[PDB]
């Protein structure tokens, strides 16, 4: 199996297919251990955001690829923004203040 870019689930904007392509591979805890061990901060940075479930990030970075710019321009993944809305959905309030 191999996947450049395909569909995503409605609930969590994570890669999945089986209708035209193949749902991308799963990372997990075992792998993030290794990346932390190496120190590949940007590798894990992309692997956790744009490369996975960053709505605008994946597209912005894809455009950066076809233009031969690479870089990244990341953002907060929906798999954490959703968690904010879920916790905020309770009587408990969480905010992300600046400095």
């Amino acid at each position: 199996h191999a996947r450049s870019t395909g569909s995503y689930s409605l609930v969590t904007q994570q890669p999945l297919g089986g209708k035209a392509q193949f749902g991308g591979q799963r990372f997990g805890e075992m792998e993030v251990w290794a990346l932390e061990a190496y120190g590949a901060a940007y590798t894990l940075q992309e692997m956790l955001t744009v490369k996975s479930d960053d709505v605008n990030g994946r597209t912005k970075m894809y455009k950066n690829i076809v233009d031969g710019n690479h870089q990244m321009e990341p953002g907060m993944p929906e798999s954490f923004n959703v968690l904010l809305k879920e916790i905020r959905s309770l009587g408990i309030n969480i905010e992300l203040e600046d400095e």
Binding site: T5, L10, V11, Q13, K19, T59, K63
Partner: protein, 118 residues
């Protein structure tokens, strides 16, 4: 057929949190793909299309670029008709359509928009 449509309203129905394959662990709501989103490839092609068309209307004249641009309404939101453009360019209707047809005549050699079609 009325009865057919009736049975299409029965049941709650099913919830997403229903186990299916019993993996580790399966969930019906996890197989549902999103469709409101567009493919990144599709987005890139649309972007390149804007640049392509924005680069094609450069090889035209002002009284032809603006004509094709305004008639089919591009980069100006509200699209106008033959009358609203025929009044702003003196000669009304047919005249502005002639150029509108001539502009289309020019685009019979370039391959950019051709391949962008598909």
């Amino acid at each position: 057929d009325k009865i057919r449509k009736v049975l299409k309203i029965a049941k709650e129905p099913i919830s997403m949190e229903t186990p299916i394959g019993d993996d580790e662990d399966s969930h019906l709501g996890d197989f549902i793909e999103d469709t409101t989103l567009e493919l990144p490839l599709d987005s890139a092609t649309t972007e390149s299309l804007r640049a392509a068309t924005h680069d094609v209307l450069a090889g035209l004249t002002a009284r032809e670029a603006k004509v094709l641009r305004m008639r089919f309404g591009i980069d100006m939101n509200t699209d106008y008709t033959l009358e609203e453009v025929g009044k702003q360019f003196d000669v009304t209707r047919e005249r502005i359509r002639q150029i509108e047809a001539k502009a289309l005549r020019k685009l019979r050699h370039p391959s950019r928009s051709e391949v962008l079609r598909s």
